[PDB]
């Protein structure tokens, strides 16, 4: 089945600057009982940010043990408490700074690593679908559509079933999405089970920082008005698709209305969204929704309401009749 509401669990990825690093110093991983709590909530489906330099130290060659062996130790717990995982592969095009399809990272290593992930753990009945790449954007834009190619050949050589998702140029922006993805309309899935996931953000420049409060002209359908490029190019393509990262800062009713009015747009459209998010160590993080001593959380109530919802039979928007 395919879920319409579902959370980020970020925290793998973190500390970029130390690789390997250390776990429980520099990145996290879900602790025991972390599942649990939102399995109880309602919450059925996650998105799991993974750095490819960690699992993969040097290209072209068999995954880390240690790392890797951490990512088997989520999914084994997320199977327990009745949660489906996306691996997202959370990189920006780039391995160690370096754009994929540049002589330093040539498309075959982003194909192997594909391939890798993939074979590791297509038997795992927690794994619902592959995010191959996070947000490619700058010098990543051009080169993206080739690389996706071969990161969907990667993963198909070991998985015809799940759901592959996929990324746009300028990191995967929603707002912008008709401005580049034509480019995107080459790409080929065998077994036809490709989605192409956006992301959005309500602050003024679509980043999600959230550098100012709402204003005195703030739209409640601003959330919705970013999502239909995106989803308007779906409907003229006959493409499917996803909302990978959207969030809001707990301090503004008005955020919550806004997410609301997105969230019955995507519900109607049977685009299913992943909230960025919680994880086992935010911290003061504005946009987290993980539980913290004297923080509200009123997105994850809104949240429920839809997470209570019929989803649909497959990832929208649905073919014109």
């Not at 059925?44 to 990512?71: C, G, I, M």
């Not at 071969?150 to 990324?167: H, N, S, T, W």
Request: with cysteine; charged share 30%; proline share 6%.
């Amino acid at each position: 089945s395919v879920d319409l509401i579902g959370i980020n669990v970020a925290g793998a990825e973190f500390t970029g600057g130390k690789l390997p690093g250390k776990h429980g110093t520099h990145y996290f991983f879900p602790p025991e009982g972390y599942f649990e709590y939102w399995s109880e909530q309602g919450i059925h489906t996650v998105r799991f940010p993974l750095k490819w330099e960690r699992l993969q130290p040097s290209l072209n060659a068999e995954l880390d043990d240690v790392y890797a062996s951490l990512v088997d130790d989520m999914l084994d717990q997320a199977k327990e408490n009745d949660i489906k995982v996306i691996l997202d592969v959370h990189n920006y095009a780039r391995y160690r700074k370096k754009v994929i399809g540049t002589e330093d990272v040539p498309v075959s290593a982003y194909q192997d690593l594909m391939e890798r992930i993939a074979k590791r753990w297509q038997g795992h009945d927690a794994l619902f679908a592959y995010d191959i790449m996070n947000e490619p954007y700058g010098s990543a834009d051009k080169l993206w559509p080739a690389a996706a190619q071969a990161g969907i050949d990667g993963v198909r050589k070991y998985d015809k079933k799940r759901p592959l998702l996929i990324e746009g140029a300028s990191w995967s922006s929603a707002a912008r999405w008709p401005r580049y993805a034509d480019e995107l309309l080459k790409l080929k899935d065998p077994a036809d089970n490709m989605v192409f996931s956006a992301h959005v953000y309500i602050d003024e420049d679509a980043s999600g920082s959230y550098k100012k409060g709402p204003g005195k002209d703030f739209e409640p359908m601003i959330g919705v008005k970013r999502v239909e490029p995106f989803v308007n190019w779906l409907k003229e393509h006959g493409k499917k698709g996803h909302i990978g990262e959207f969030g809001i800062p707990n301090d503004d009713e008005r955020w919550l209305d806004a997410m609301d009015k997105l969230l019955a747009y995507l519900n109607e459209n049977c685009i299913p969204i992943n909230y960025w998010a919680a994880g086992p160590s935010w911290g003061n993080y504005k946009l987290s929704i993980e539980p913290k001593d004297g923080e509200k959380r009123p997105q994850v109530a809104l949240l429920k309401k839809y997470a209570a919802k019929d989803n649909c039979s497959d990832f929208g928007p649905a073919k014109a009749e």
